Design a protein around this ligand. Structure first.
Ligand SMILES: [Cl-]
Ligand SMILES: [Cl-]
Ligand SMILES: [Cl-]
Ligand SMILES: [Cl-]
Ligand code: NA
Ligand SMILES: [Zn+2]
Ligand SMILES: [Zn+2]
Ligand SMILES: [Zn+2]
Ligand SMILES: [Zn+2]
Ligand SMILES: [Zn+2]
Lengths: 143, 145
């Protein structure tokens, strides 16, 4: 009861942490993909690959958190956008790795930033709504 | 697209985490203090005690990370708010423990929530500003040259 309330409130820190880590994974993927387009070395290709695994890991962690009703709606949208984003970043990396046109690399890569922006904008809104519901639930328990 | 830019951007996650975690430690000290005062019992004194050590650790993690210039203002004040809030929390505890008068304990208790809400308000403002700053730095870092 008190224990179950406290269990609810203690999700805050981890929920916020998972959201930011998904945020940061989306960034790191964009950053590593851009850098590999820029300089098609082994270490760069490897860093991109590692970034995509980090992204799948962050999406999964994020997916597992209980969310507020508002929060869960956005969450679905966020998670549904992650596979297309990964997919596009994989095509980029592949286009580079296989020696594509400097023009084909440019085109694959140009696809990413609109997806990145959308993904980051949804997570930012998720953070805002969830934190508001956290504040309401917080007050109910401490009252 | 240099290494120095990854290092900058990789601070986002931990900083955000340390902010949420301090937010949570502060709630948790409030929640255990209240529960103790409502129902004085050994495990509840223990938890308030544990919550206090947790808050000192969360403050220390948060104080350790670099912050944007906007944050640095709010930041300084957040951290200075912690000791007074802990000190009040100890005084509520100690009052319940030493066998306080139902009135005096209500007074010490009442002195907590204002301090909690102010600190949490600051923290959330800090989060919003740092987020806006991180979003602008990320954008710039990934801009086409
Ligand atoms: Cl990054
Ligand atoms: Cl709600
Ligand atoms: Cl709590
Ligand atoms: Cl922006
Ligand atoms: Na509040
Ligand atoms: Zn990175
Ligand atoms: Zn709500
Ligand atoms: Zn708690
Ligand atoms: Zn700034
Ligand atoms: Zn942007």
């Amino acid at each position: 009861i008190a224990a179950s309330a406290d269990a609810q409130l203690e999700l805050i820190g981890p929920r916020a942490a998972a959201a930011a880590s998904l945020e940061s994974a989306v960034l790191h993927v964009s950053l590593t993909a851009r850098a590999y387009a820029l300089t098609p070395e082994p270490a760069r290709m490897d860093a991109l690959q590692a970034a995509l695994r980090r992204l799948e890991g962050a999406a999964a962690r994020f997916a597992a958190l209980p969310k507020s009703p508002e929060g869960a709606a956005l969450s679905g949208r966020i998670l549904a956008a992650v596979p297309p984003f990964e997919k596009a970043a994989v095509a980029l990396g592949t286009a580079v790795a296989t020696g594509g046109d400097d023009s084909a690399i440019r085109a694959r890569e140009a696809t990413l930033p609109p997806m990145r922006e959308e993904l980051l904008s949804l997570l930012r809104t998720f953070g805002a709504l969830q934190q508001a519901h956290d504040a309401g639930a917080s007050h109910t328990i401490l009252a």
